[PDB]
Amino acid sequence: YDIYSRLLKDRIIMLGSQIDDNVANSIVSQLLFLQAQDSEKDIYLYINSPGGSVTAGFAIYDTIQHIKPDVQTICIGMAASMGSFLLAAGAKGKRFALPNAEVMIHQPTEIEIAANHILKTREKLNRILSERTGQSIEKIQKDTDRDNFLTAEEAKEYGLIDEVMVP
Amino acid sequence: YDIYSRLLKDRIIMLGSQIDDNVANSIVSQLLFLQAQDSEKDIYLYINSPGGSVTAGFAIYDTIQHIKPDVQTICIGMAASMGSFLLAAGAKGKRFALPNAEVMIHQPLQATEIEIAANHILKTREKLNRILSERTGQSIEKIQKDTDRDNFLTAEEAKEYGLIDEVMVP
Amino acid sequence: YDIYSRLLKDRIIMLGSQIDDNVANSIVSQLLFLQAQDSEKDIYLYINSPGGSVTAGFAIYDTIQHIKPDVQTICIGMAASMGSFLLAAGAKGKRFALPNAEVMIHQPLQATEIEIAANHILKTREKLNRILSERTGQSIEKIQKDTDRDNFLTAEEAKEYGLIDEVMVP
Amino acid sequence: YDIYSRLLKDRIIMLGSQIDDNVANSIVSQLLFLQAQDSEKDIYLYINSPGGSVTAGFAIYDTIQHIKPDVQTICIGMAASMGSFLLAAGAKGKRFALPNAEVMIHQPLQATEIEIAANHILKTREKLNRILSERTGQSIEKIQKDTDRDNFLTAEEAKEYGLIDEVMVPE
Amino acid sequence: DIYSRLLKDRIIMLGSQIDDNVANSIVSQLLFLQAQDSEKDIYLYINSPGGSVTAGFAIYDTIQHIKPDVQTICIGMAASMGSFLLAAGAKGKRFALPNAEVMIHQPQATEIEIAANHILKTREKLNRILSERTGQSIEKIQKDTDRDNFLTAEEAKEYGLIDEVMVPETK
Amino acid sequence: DIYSRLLKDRIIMLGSQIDDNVANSIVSQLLFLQAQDSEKDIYLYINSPGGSVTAGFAIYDTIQHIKPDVQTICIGMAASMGSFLLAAGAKGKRFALPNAEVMIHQPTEIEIAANHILKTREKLNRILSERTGQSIEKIQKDTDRDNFLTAEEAKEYGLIDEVMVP
Amino acid sequence: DIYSRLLKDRIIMLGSQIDDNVANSIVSQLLFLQAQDSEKDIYLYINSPGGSVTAGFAIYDTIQHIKPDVQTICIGMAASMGSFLLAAGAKGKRFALPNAEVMIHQPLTEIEIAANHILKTREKLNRILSERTGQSIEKIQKDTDRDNFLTAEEAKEYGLIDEVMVPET
Amino acid sequence: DIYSRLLKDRIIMLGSQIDDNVANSIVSQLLFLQAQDSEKDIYLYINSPGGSVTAGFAIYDTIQHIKPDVQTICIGMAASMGSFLLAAGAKGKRFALPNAEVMIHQPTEIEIAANHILKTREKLNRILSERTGQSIEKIQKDTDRDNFLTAEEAKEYGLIDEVMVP
Amino acid sequence: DIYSRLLKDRIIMLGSQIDDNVANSIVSQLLFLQAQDSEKDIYLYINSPGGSVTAGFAIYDTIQHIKPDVQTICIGMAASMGSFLLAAGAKGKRFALPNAEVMIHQPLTEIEIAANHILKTREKLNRILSERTGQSIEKIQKDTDRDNFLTAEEAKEYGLIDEVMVPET
Amino acid sequence: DIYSRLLKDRIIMLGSQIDDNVANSIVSQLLFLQAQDSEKDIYLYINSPGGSVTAGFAIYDTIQHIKPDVQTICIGMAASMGSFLLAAGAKGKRFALPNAEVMIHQPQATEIEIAANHILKTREKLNRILSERTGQSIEKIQKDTDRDNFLTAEEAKEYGLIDEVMVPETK
Amino acid sequence: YDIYSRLLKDRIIMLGSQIDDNVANSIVSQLLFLQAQDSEKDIYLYINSPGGSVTAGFAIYDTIQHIKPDVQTICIGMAASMGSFLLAAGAKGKRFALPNAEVMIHQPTEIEIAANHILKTREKLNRILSERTGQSIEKIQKDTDRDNFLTAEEAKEYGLIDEVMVP
Amino acid sequence: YDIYSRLLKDRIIMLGSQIDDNVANSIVSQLLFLQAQDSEKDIYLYINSPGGSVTAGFAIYDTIQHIKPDVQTICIGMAASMGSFLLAAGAKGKRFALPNAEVMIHQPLQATEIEIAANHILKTREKLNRILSERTGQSIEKIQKDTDRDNFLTAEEAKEYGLIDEVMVP
């Protein structure tokens, strides 16, 4: 849609789908574009995503950490998976969820999957989540193996977000 | 369609279809865009929707309550569902329906696998009922009963129920 | 076509297909756009339609009556159904048909599941007959009879019936 | 196509396909647009059409007669059906065919269910025959006979029949 | 959109099989270019395996009708109606590039079109026009349009289908 | 739309199999660039597995016909017609990048009939002979077998004038 | 069309499998950027599972041919020709983000495949990788025959990249 | 294959919209059953929303032509042609199940032309008039409007002889 | 074609949404089995989310018309017309397996729908359900307007079935 | 498979548009039934809107060639080649059911077929055969095959297309 | 295939796909058919299934418990979900897995889903699994919420099967 | 195809495609069928397969080892993969390849989401390597190395590796 291009003018990026390579390349491209426009002004990444590929998710994650602008993350609707991993990766103090958002950290192509298990990217995810939430690796390991959905408040108490945006 | 982009210039958003993630993301984007354009002038959300996903519906609902501009809601045609839930969520004093609109709050029982599991673990049905109860002034007991059955309301009955503030008479 | 966007500049809207929710939302959007452009200058709604959903038709009807500009209706080709209902709903003195246009008010007995249930519970068929009665000057008894059978009218007969004010002369 | 919108600037409309409701609505829209642009300057309607729906054809016919500008009709290629009916409906003195154009008035027996019922109840076939009779100068008896059989006419024969005023002969 | 920029230079590309859609597009471009400027001539490049004769005659008639000279240049191939249109360019201004292939064999058309062709005897009309434009007798045109003889650009020039082979300057 | 921006720099990309659609596109771009400027030369990059000889000849003839020099640069691959068009660039201005692969092996209905009646195979072989400096006998032999050439071998053969070294 | 705006900043995204269409697109962008400015360097971001070696060599040759330095940055993954192109960036200017995954395993259209084995392009790949990594041909031959995934750090130690881009700027 | 086993019991199922394919199928089954046995009657079950009148007339004529009595039983629905064929069963042997719904409202290219030139609408109305005992005036009125009949109302109308009560 | 072998044992499987095609198939099987033997009863297994009421009434009427008793057994689910047909089995011979789910909610082609509302078939459904369950029309009207799922035990207590088939035989 | 059981009773159903596939199927069945028994006659039921004349002539020629009499019975409709084949049944054994509709208007064929028809003048051949088999003059057949006149079964019998309307015994 | 019909002659049923309504109706039909053939001889249900609908799974489960013949269950390849639930529902002493089979008890159309949560079929599953494995409801609840894969031996030790079929 | 059903009469099974769940279920079914026919007479499994899912491959493997009849394995064309894993799993002394067959044990890194998660949690790669080690007599170290690289073996080399017992020479 042309709405997303107008939103880009306001430094707003919408991650509103499953995270595959195409989506990752699009999100990465928009982040690089906004840095090139202005390296100081922060970016607003809205997340409504059921999750996706961890390789594609790590591409977005690394780009967020690499660029100069702060990237604010705002969960609307849902963040499962890599969605919630990216939510937790926003600039510190600037990770949000709207009051009725639902968050799940449960971590559920061919060459990508082989790489993940050889390089042990699951361990890498768990360690990053542990650092960014302040939870122990033991707790992250347990919770990323089961299907526990969190409310916005519970996500804040968990350390996945900093604040619930109150109306 | 280039009519909807021209309408966006007048701060008018059309929700004329079933509410899925794509529609919600589109509606949310338009609301965020209009706030960025002008945070003071209110927005006109026209609703002709048979309903849809509750996760997608809550995304729109939360964005409406989050942004600074008042969001007026106007039912044309039909609002069932999440459609009528969003109608009832408009700025107070600014929820309308045209005279021959039809409204149903029946929350049926358009969403995906992971969404559905979340709804029942977090008990979003209870959350819907409680919000409707607050915004209509009806008791939770009555909202629970009415969201379980298929009762269609006229525009007048919807006003009488507390879903809208006014029937827009010619 | 891009022709329709250029026509919108002259405040002309073309209703040239079957009336479903998509078409209704498009026609409603164009009417709201043209009002926002100019609330005083009247609008020209050309109708060549075999009919469609009554819920969708009522959305267009309500929007026509709601907006400030007069909406002129001009039948080219055919108006059956909701098409002829909308033709009769144009601004008074400003409902037309071209000489070889064909009009039928038969309301057959395009719409979706929820819509059809709403129509019968809220008795929109009665509503249609009553509105047609008011706008043609015919009694409800006569409208009821004619909307149950398949009688096609010429442009002249449609004028004599009260569905249009004038057949446009070359 | 990009080309048809540029042609619209020159008040040229191309009817180069079978006449259904979509085509009729498009042609009618272009005619209404050109009148709104300028109600005095005449319009050029080029016709290469194997025919189509009579309801859709009548919509174009009525719009041609209704608007103020003269509508010149020029047959290139073929006009069978409603195509040749519309060719005959152009402004008088301004109906043409190129030398190798082929014209057929055979009204066969592109319309939808409701349209077909309307035609036979309202007797639009009689209406077609009477309009053709008036515009060609032929008797209704002859039009009735010829619209029932498959007789193809050359550009010259179409002129002699009264369907066109002139065949545009090369430079 | 390359074709729209080319239209600015009064260049038209006929690079496909000739059906009603193509004919209507080519006719539209010819009418557009006349409206732009009725004096400056037009360049019609042809790379076409042939097509419908009704659609081909529409293009032919439009070429002869408009005021500007229409130069025809064969690149690649012209078979059929393709070669018929090549031969229909302004006299003295019909060309082919050295490795172009030309075939006049008259072997795409829809139902009503085909019936018209045989009733009005358009095959005879084709043969007579080709005879006039090549300077060959009708007897020779009749024989050659019935068999599959491919011509080189030079042979096409010697046949009278074109006026010159465009020989490239060495570079 | 990258290709439309490249057209502004008089660069054309032939990056696919050569059929009538591609030929008409390439021919149109060549004619457009001539109309823009008939003196400044054109850059035709070639990465093509080959295709129709009739379509290929349409491009070939257009290259020779227009006034500007057309430089030909092989990136990736030129088999078929692809290599025929590579060899047809302005003399002194036919290039291949170092790892380009070139094959001269010459492997619709009406088109195919034309080729064999008019003997376009003989026509190809002779044009290749003239433009490479090889004898017709050698061209005939090599166009019947599947011998791939490196950029250097293509230069030594006479298909290109120079390999563009990094 | 974010990619057309990115082109204004001399940024090219290679985010898919490398076939002839992708190669022609990447080559076209490289030629375009050189024409815009032959002095300022180009940023080629790579997230690619690999692809055709003929198509890959077209990109490789174009990178080496043009005047601007082409920086290569691996985000996500580079397997294949993807990692081959990563290693082909301007020297000192080949990067990977910390969680990127790199594989040099060269796995095992019609006319393209015949060319590769007649001209022995596999040998050519191995020799170029050897030169650009500093590894021996023997080691490159061994490693391109097996499926060993490398972390960003391991890719740097191998010589495929010059630096792991540290989370900052 | 249930329908082939049913054919063994001289049962035919008309359970869809009536087009030429269905008509040719139904006609073929009627002709087959006559050839098997010209004395034993046939059971035609009808659950049809209607269809082409030309196709419907093909079935109608075949029913009247063959020697065996054809019993007609409406299950579910008979609108259109569907109800016309229901009314065309052997006299005393036209049935509907208690909750069946019947409508007589009469709503390819060459077929449609034939119907209006030969006036098959008049032909339908008159056959319905003969077989129901209703006047042509009443049939004309009722075939122009959408009046659904219960099984009992269909019997009282004369479309069927009996409603089969459980 | 397991279903054709099952037909030999007078077993019919209604395991899908009830449309005209399914109804014609079920009706055909019922007529076939009566012709085979008009005395031995028939076993109709139901796992159906519902469907068209016209199609459902065709099956219902055929069940009541034929001579053999038709036993109805709900496996999995019966919503709709599915549960309506379940309740229409021979009396004493309507069953559900222990974990079956039953819903009587009557939810809310072209010509079919018009017929239903003119002839008031909704009223007809409610009255038949009332008669066969022993519940009042008022209660049936209320319950067919809301989405209340019943367990097998609850369906028995409601009067939709006669017995929950206990795990044995 | 109902059709294979019917074949046992020497019954063939022509219930569709007549193309090459249908013609080959009908011809095959006729040859099969002759091989089964060359004396017992065949029953060809016709419900056909028409089709290709080449395909229709294949069926026609096969009917006249085989030894068994071929009875033709029109149910529903016979237009075109359908009515031509109806008229081609064994004399005395051509029937229609009372509500059948017949049209002889000669309006499906592939490219090579259509060229053959007009070179060999198969339209003339059709008209002459119809003339012989109905007893009407060629002049009348020519006129009527050019217009869209539908005939009732009785009118078709009176025209000479069939020998009898099969009137049903009341039951 | 015609192989499955020949296998039916040996009272062997193959459940080798995802369990939806169509599959359930097919499996149920085969079970009813085999009972009608012979009500005394036991049935062999081979399972290679990634899981599926719980309503469809309960239909098969109930039919297994209802019919007279013992139903032996043999896991080949995989049993996740309802697959493993049906594996555990075989006649007691007659639930098997081949040595390299993989078992997971993790319990991950419109009207079906509503019914499940109103009637609390998840509780019903957990209680049945508890009864048939001998594990406590607390343990079943925990394990059906997380993605723990079991070997054939581990499945036997868990109580999902009685024996690993040794070569 | 009716050739494969006639071949089943001679106790011959053809595995001539990629190994997915459908193929595995088909092969397993045929093995169970042939055992039921006759538990003593051995079975001939011809293999021309580029490999596939390891879960599906293990299903076939387990069934081969479970049933009573000896299963002879004969490689025609190619066995990569799971294909070659199954070739090596034939009855001992009865594993063959035709002279121009090609064998690769490279276990690449055709299966579905849940399958792949199981393989890595239960470490089925280790299980494959250990079984190959036992059935070829090669050390686990060598099997680990060779299953990680793409080394194609001739029929002779496959015999020399211990994957087959004999090359079937004409």
Coordinates of all heavy atoms in Angstrom, one line a residue, chain F residues 2-3 5-6 9 13 15 45 47 49 75-77 97-101 103 148-150 164 166, chain G residues 7 20 24-25 27-28 31-32 35 54 57-58 60-62 64-65 111 115-116 118-119 121 124:
Chain F
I2 N 15.0 0.2 -13.0 CA 16.4 0.3 -13.1 C 16.8 0.4 -14.5 O 17.7 1.2 -14.9 CB 17.2 -0.8 -12.4 CG1 18.7 -0.5 -12.4 CG2 16.9 -2.2 -13.0 CD1 19.1 0.8 -11.7
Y3 N 16.2 -0.4 -15.4 CA 16.5 -0.4 -16.8 C 16.1 0.9 -17.5 O 16.7 1.3 -18.5 CB 15.8 -1.6 -17.5 CG 16.2 -2.9 -16.9 CD1 15.5 -3.6 -16.0 CD2 17.5 -3.5 -17.3 CE1 15.9 -4.8 -15.5 CE2 17.9 -4.7 -16.8 CZ 17.1 -5.4 -15.9 OH 17.6 -6.6 -15.3
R5 N 16.3 3.9 -16.0 CA 17.3 4.8 -15.5 C 18.6 4.5 -16.3 O 19.3 5.5 -16.7 CB 17.6 4.7 -14.0 CG 16.5 5.2 -13.1 CD 16.0 6.6 -13.4 NE 17.0 7.6 -13.2 CZ 17.5 8.2 -12.1 NH1 17.0 7.8 -10.9 NH2 18.4 9.1 -12.1
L6 N 18.9 3.3 -16.6 CA 20.1 2.9 -17.4 C 20.0 3.4 -18.8 O 21.0 3.7 -19.4 CB 20.2 1.3 -17.4 CG 21.5 0.7 -16.7 CD1 22.1 1.6 -15.6 CD2 21.0 -0.6 -16.1
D9 N 21.6 6.5 -19.5 CA 23.0 6.4 -19.7 C 23.4 5.7 -20.9 O 24.6 5.3 -21.1 CB 23.7 5.8 -18.5 CG 23.4 6.5 -17.2 OD1 23.5 7.7 -17.1 OD2 23.2 5.8 -16.1
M13 N 20.4 -3.7 -21.5 CA 20.7 -5.0 -20.9 C 19.9 -6.1 -21.6 O 18.7 -6.1 -21.6 CB 20.3 -5.0 -19.4 CG 20.9 -3.9 -18.6 SD 22.7 -4.0 -18.4 CE 22.9 -5.5 -17.5
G15 N 19.5 -9.6 -21.0 CA 19.8 -10.6 -19.9 C 18.9 -11.8 -19.9 O 18.7 -12.4 -18.9
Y45 N 24.9 -4.7 -22.9 CA 25.4 -5.8 -22.0 C 24.7 -7.1 -22.3 O 23.4 -7.1 -22.5 CB 25.3 -5.4 -20.6 CG 26.3 -4.3 -20.2 CD1 26.0 -3.0 -20.4 CD2 27.5 -4.6 -19.6 CE1 26.9 -2.0 -20.0 CE2 28.4 -3.7 -19.3 CZ 28.1 -2.3 -19.5 OH 29.0 -1.3 -19.1
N47 N 24.0 -11.1 -21.4 CA 24.0 -12.3 -20.6 C 22.8 -13.2 -21.0 O 21.7 -13.2 -20.4 CB 23.9 -12.0 -19.1 CG 24.0 -13.2 -18.2 OD1 24.4 -14.3 -18.6 ND2 23.5 -13.1 -16.9
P49 N 21.5 -17.0 -22.9 CA 21.7 -18.4 -23.4 C 21.4 -18.6 -24.9 O 21.6 -19.8 -25.3 CB 20.8 -19.2 -22.5 CG 19.7 -18.3 -22.2 CD 20.2 -16.9 -22.1
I75 N 28.7 -10.3 -20.1 CA 28.8 -10.7 -18.7 C 28.1 -12.0 -18.5 O 27.1 -12.3 -19.1 CB 28.1 -9.6 -17.7 CG1 26.6 -9.7 -17.8 CG2 28.6 -8.2 -18.1 CD1 25.8 -8.6 -17.1
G76 N 28.7 -12.9 -17.7 CA 28.1 -14.2 -17.4 C 28.2 -15.2 -18.6 O 29.2 -15.9 -18.7
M77 N 27.3 -15.1 -19.5 CA 27.2 -16.1 -20.6 C 26.7 -15.5 -22.0 O 25.8 -14.6 -22.0 CB 26.3 -17.2 -20.2 CG 25.7 -18.1 -21.3 SD 25.3 -19.7 -20.8 CE 26.9 -20.5 -20.8
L97 N 33.8 -9.8 -19.9 CA 34.5 -9.8 -18.5 C 35.2 -11.1 -18.4 O 34.9 -12.1 -19.0 CB 33.4 -9.5 -17.4 CG 32.7 -8.2 -17.5 CD1 31.8 -8.0 -16.3 CD2 33.6 -7.0 -17.7
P98 N 36.2 -11.1 -17.5 CA 37.2 -12.2 -17.4 C 36.6 -13.6 -17.3 O 37.2 -14.6 -17.8 CB 38.1 -11.9 -16.2 CG 38.0 -10.4 -16.1 CD 36.6 -10.1 -16.5
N99 N 35.5 -13.8 -16.5 CA 34.9 -15.1 -16.3 C 33.7 -15.4 -17.1 O 32.9 -16.3 -16.8 CB 34.6 -15.2 -14.8 CG 35.9 -15.3 -13.9 OD1 36.6 -16.3 -13.9 ND2 36.2 -14.2 -13.2
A100 N 33.5 -14.6 -18.2 CA 32.4 -14.8 -19.1 C 32.6 -16.1 -19.9 O 33.7 -16.5 -20.2 CB 32.2 -13.6 -20.0
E101 N 31.5 -16.8 -20.3 CA 31.5 -18.0 -21.0 C 30.8 -17.8 -22.4 O 29.7 -17.4 -22.4 CB 30.9 -19.1 -20.2 CG 30.9 -18.9 -18.7 CD 30.7 -20.2 -17.9 OE1 31.7 -21.0 -17.8 OE2 29.6 -20.4 -17.4
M103 N 29.8 -19.5 -26.2 CA 29.6 -20.6 -27.1 C 28.9 -20.2 -28.4 O 27.8 -19.6 -28.4 CB 28.7 -21.7 -26.4 CG 28.3 -22.8 -27.3 SD 27.6 -24.3 -26.4 CE 25.9 -23.7 -26.1
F148 N 32.6 -24.6 -25.5 CA 32.6 -23.4 -24.7 C 34.0 -22.7 -24.7 O 35.0 -23.4 -24.6 CB 32.1 -23.6 -23.3 CG 30.6 -23.8 -23.2 CD1 30.1 -25.1 -23.2 CD2 29.8 -22.7 -23.0 CE1 28.7 -25.3 -23.2 CE2 28.4 -22.9 -22.9 CZ 27.9 -24.2 -23.0
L149 N 34.0 -21.4 -24.8 CA 35.2 -20.6 -24.9 C 35.3 -19.7 -23.6 O 34.2 -19.2 -23.2 CB 35.2 -19.7 -26.1 CG 35.7 -20.3 -27.5 CD1 35.7 -21.8 -27.6 CD2 34.8 -19.7 -28.6
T150 N 36.5 -19.6 -23.1 CA 36.7 -18.6 -22.0 C 36.7 -17.2 -22.7 O 36.7 -17.1 -23.9 CB 38.1 -18.8 -21.3 OG1 39.1 -18.8 -22.3 CG2 38.1 -20.2 -20.6
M164 N 38.0 -7.3 -20.7 CA 38.1 -6.2 -19.8 C 38.7 -6.7 -18.5 O 38.0 -7.4 -17.7 CB 36.7 -5.5 -19.5 CG 36.2 -4.7 -20.6 SD 34.5 -4.3 -20.4 CE 34.4 -2.7 -21.3
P166 N 40.2 -6.5 -14.7 CA 39.7 -5.7 -13.5 C 40.4 -4.4 -13.4 O 41.6 -4.3 -13.2 CB 40.1 -6.7 -12.3 CG 40.0 -8.0 -12.9 CD 40.2 -8.0 -14.4
Chain G
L7 N 18.9 3.0 -3.5 CA 19.8 3.2 -4.6 C 20.4 4.6 -4.6 O 21.6 4.8 -5.0 CB 19.1 2.9 -5.9 CG 19.9 2.2 -7.0 CD1 20.6 0.9 -6.5 CD2 19.0 1.8 -8.2
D20 N 19.7 -15.8 -13.0 CA 20.0 -14.8 -14.1 C 19.3 -13.5 -13.9 O 19.9 -12.5 -14.1 CB 19.8 -15.4 -15.4 CG 20.8 -16.5 -15.8 OD1 22.0 -16.2 -15.6 OD2 20.4 -17.5 -16.4
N24 N 21.2 -10.0 -13.3 CA 21.0 -8.9 -14.3 C 20.6 -7.7 -13.6 O 21.0 -6.6 -13.9 CB 20.0 -9.3 -15.4 CG 20.5 -10.4 -16.3 OD1 21.7 -10.6 -16.5 ND2 19.6 -11.3 -16.7
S25 N 19.7 -7.8 -12.5 CA 19.3 -6.7 -11.7 C 20.4 -6.1 -10.9 O 20.6 -4.9 -10.8 CB 18.2 -7.2 -10.8 OG 17.7 -6.1 -10.0
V27 N 23.7 -6.5 -11.4 CA 24.7 -5.9 -12.4 C 24.2 -4.5 -12.9 O 25.0 -3.6 -13.0 CB 24.9 -6.9 -13.6 CG1 25.7 -6.1 -14.7 CG2 25.7 -8.1 -13.2
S28 N 22.9 -4.4 -13.2 CA 22.4 -3.2 -13.7 C 22.5 -2.1 -12.7 O 22.8 -0.9 -13.0 CB 20.9 -3.4 -14.0 OG 20.8 -4.2 -15.2
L31 N 26.2 -1.0 -12.5 CA 26.5 -0.1 -13.6 C 25.9 1.2 -13.5 O 26.5 2.3 -13.8 CB 26.1 -0.8 -14.9 CG 26.8 -2.1 -15.3 CD1 26.2 -2.7 -16.5 CD2 28.3 -1.7 -15.6
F32 N 24.6 1.3 -13.0 CA 23.9 2.5 -12.7 C 24.7 3.4 -11.7 O 24.9 4.6 -12.0 CB 22.5 2.3 -12.2 CG 21.8 3.5 -11.7 CD1 21.4 4.5 -12.6 CD2 21.6 3.8 -10.4 CE1 20.7 5.7 -12.2 CE2 21.0 4.9 -9.9 CZ 20.5 5.9 -10.9
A35 N 27.8 5.0 -13.1 CA 27.5 6.1 -13.9 C 27.1 7.3 -13.1 O 27.4 8.5 -13.5 CB 26.4 5.7 -14.9
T54 N 27.1 -19.2 -12.8 CA 27.2 -18.4 -14.0 C 26.7 -17.0 -13.6 O 27.3 -15.9 -14.0 CB 26.4 -18.9 -15.2 OG1 27.0 -20.2 -15.6 CG2 26.5 -17.9 -16.4
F57 N 29.0 -15.4 -11.1 CA 30.2 -14.9 -11.8 C 30.0 -13.6 -12.5 O 30.9 -12.7 -12.6 CB 30.9 -15.9 -12.7 CG 32.0 -16.7 -12.1 CD1 32.0 -18.0 -12.0 CD2 33.1 -16.0 -11.7 CE1 33.0 -18.7 -11.5 CE2 34.2 -16.7 -11.2 CZ 34.2 -18.1 -11.1
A58 N 28.8 -13.4 -13.0 CA 28.4 -12.1 -13.7 C 28.4 -11.0 -12.7 O 28.9 -9.9 -13.0 CB 27.0 -12.2 -14.3
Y60 N 30.1 -11.1 -9.7 CA 31.5 -11.0 -9.3 C 32.4 -10.2 -10.3 O 33.1 -9.3 -9.9 CB 32.1 -12.4 -9.2 CG 33.6 -12.4 -9.0 CD1 34.1 -12.3 -7.7 CD2 34.5 -12.5 -10.0 CE1 35.5 -12.3 -7.4 CE2 35.9 -12.5 -9.8 CZ 36.4 -12.4 -8.5 OH 37.7 -12.4 -8.3
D61 N 32.3 -10.5 -11.6 CA 33.1 -9.8 -12.6 C 32.7 -8.3 -12.7 O 33.6 -7.5 -12.9 CB 32.8 -10.4 -14.0 CG 33.7 -11.6 -14.2 OD1 34.6 -12.0 -13.4 OD2 33.6 -12.2 -15.3
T62 N 31.4 -8.0 -12.5 CA 31.0 -6.6 -12.5 C 31.5 -5.8 -11.3 O 31.9 -4.7 -11.5 CB 29.4 -6.5 -12.6 OG1 28.9 -7.2 -13.7 CG2 29.0 -5.0 -12.7
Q64 N 34.3 -6.5 -9.7 CA 35.8 -6.2 -10.0 C 36.0 -5.2 -11.1 O 37.0 -4.6 -11.1 CB 36.5 -7.5 -10.3 CG 36.3 -8.7 -9.3 CD 36.3 -8.2 -7.8 OE1 35.5 -8.7 -7.0 NE2 37.2 -7.4 -7.4
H65 N 35.1 -5.1 -12.0 CA 35.3 -4.3 -13.2 C 35.1 -2.8 -12.9 O 35.9 -2.0 -13.4 CB 34.3 -4.7 -14.4 CG 34.5 -3.8 -15.6 ND1 33.5 -2.9 -16.0 CD2 35.5 -3.6 -16.4 CE1 33.9 -2.3 -17.1 NE2 35.1 -2.7 -17.4
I111 N 22.2 -25.1 -20.5 CA 23.4 -24.6 -21.2 C 24.5 -24.1 -20.3 O 25.7 -24.3 -20.5 CB 23.1 -23.5 -22.2 CG1 21.7 -23.7 -22.9 CG2 24.2 -23.5 -23.3 CD1 21.3 -22.6 -23.8
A115 N 28.6 -25.5 -19.6 CA 29.7 -24.6 -19.6 C 30.6 -24.7 -18.4 O 31.8 -24.6 -18.5 CB 29.2 -23.2 -19.8
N116 N 30.0 -24.8 -17.2 CA 30.7 -24.8 -16.0 C 31.7 -26.0 -15.9 O 32.8 -25.8 -15.3 CB 29.7 -24.9 -14.8 CG 28.7 -23.8 -14.8 OD1 27.5 -24.0 -14.4 ND2 29.1 -22.6 -15.3
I118 N 32.8 -28.0 -18.6 CA 33.8 -27.9 -19.7 C 34.9 -26.9 -19.4 O 36.1 -27.2 -19.6 CB 33.1 -27.6 -21.0 CG1 32.3 -28.8 -21.5 CG2 34.1 -27.2 -22.1 CD1 31.2 -28.4 -22.5
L119 N 34.5 -25.7 -19.0 CA 35.5 -24.7 -18.7 C 36.1 -24.8 -17.2 O 37.0 -24.0 -16.9 CB 34.9 -23.3 -18.8 CG 34.4 -23.0 -20.3 CD1 33.7 -21.6 -20.3 CD2 35.5 -23.0 -21.3
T121 N 34.8 -24.2 -14.1 CA 34.5 -23.0 -13.3 C 34.6 -23.3 -11.8 O 34.8 -22.4 -11.0 CB 33.2 -22.4 -13.6 OG1 32.1 -23.3 -13.3 CG2 33.1 -22.0 -15.1
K124 N 38.0 -22.6 -10.9 CA 38.1 -21.1 -11.0 C 37.6 -20.5 -9.7 O 38.2 -19.5 -9.1 CB 37.4 -20.6 -12.2 CG 37.7 -19.1 -12.5 CD 39.1 -18.9 -13.0 CE 39.5 -17.4 -12.9 NZ 39.2 -16.6 -14.0

